[PDB]
Design a protein around this nucleic acid. Sequence first.
DNA 1: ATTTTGACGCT
DNA 2: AGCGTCAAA
Length: 429
Amino acid sequence: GPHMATGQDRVVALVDMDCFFVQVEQRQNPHLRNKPCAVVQYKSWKGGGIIAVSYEARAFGVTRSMWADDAKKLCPDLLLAQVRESRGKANLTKYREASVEVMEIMSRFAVIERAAIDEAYVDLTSAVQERLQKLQGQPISADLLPSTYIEGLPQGPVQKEGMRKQGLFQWLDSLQIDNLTSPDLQLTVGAVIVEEMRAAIERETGFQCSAGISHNKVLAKLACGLNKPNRQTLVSHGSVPQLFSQMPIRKIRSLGGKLGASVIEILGIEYMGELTQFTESQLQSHFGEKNGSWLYAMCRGIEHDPVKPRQLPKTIGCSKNFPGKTALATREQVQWWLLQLAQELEERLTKDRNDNDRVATQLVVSIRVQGDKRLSSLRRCCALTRYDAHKMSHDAFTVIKNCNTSGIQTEWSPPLTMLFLCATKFSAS
DNA sequence: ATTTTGACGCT
DNA sequence: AGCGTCAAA
Ligand SMILES: [Ca+2]
Ligand SMILES: [Mg+2]
Ligand SMILES: [Mg+2]
């Protein structure tokens, strides 16, 4: 009752760019705008692998991971843009730079946590308080929320936009605008701010995005996906029981893999809401102390993970796969590709040092051997003392050379199916 | 023969 | 330290 926390103490948003790499390419090439199109890496093998897909193309069934040749069977007029290749490998610089554009705009509004190349969490609690003080009891107009959905509404006693407006009207009609401590009002002001933030992103970059607004990161992330693209969704604390009552467990962030499968298998449930019937101790007994407490609160819509103040990636990495017959089988091959990776890494590190006043101090080398299901077969670290590609490639070879079983120095066995260099452990400079 | 990435947890 | 999990385009 009066002491039961309800996880309504924060306003958190998650902003996620729509079909991000596709929008980057469509901004650059107006011929691709408003078309079924996809972004692909490589082209020799089956037309290249698709990594991003416009919503027009998704209507034909085109998805990520599809070979372009196969996507063309579903969508013969599909347009394609290719990821840049440099030093023999795909190079994602254009998308990293577009990401910086968006992150820098979002940072003007509030502290953000960079969650991926195209998404960030926003802690809006303080901004909401400020805006509520500015508003001075003034009601919030639907015109301030032109792309907002209120999850769960409309309810009670045939076009998409009509339903959105009906739900928003029910919500705003029911709000108590004089209570500055009302969580629902705080979320609503949050959504007003997010409309402003999304408008700024689109104005200043050309890119559209979706967003979720709720009381914590997990619900904000879930909310964001409910009405893509180019829309935002408010998930209130009160919407949680109905929302979770038919929500597959795997849809909640962190439960899409083995742990989620085990929750389903061990407990014999399917939906997030069903978790409420277990005690905290029961959940801890199956999934561990940390996961158990997290599940117990999360299934009630409560999560405390903070929006971390971090706009920049914590690592800078470069990797290449060598699938099937292309696996690296000679020492020379391994050294040449380590050099290519190290040259890209050097370029990115030097730019990072100039832009962000920091230097990486550890180099992580990872390889995969043909026959291993795991992404990485072996990982070794060494000191990163100079931004020099020849030194980094030599040091990586030094730390992995003993993995070569082959009695012949010139041959590498078992062949390598992946090389990965990652700069970590940044210090101020 | 998806590939190329991050962030963080466990021991 | 080195390995595993989960998530992005
Ligand atoms: Ca996205
Ligand atoms: Mg994303
Ligand atoms: Mg996606």
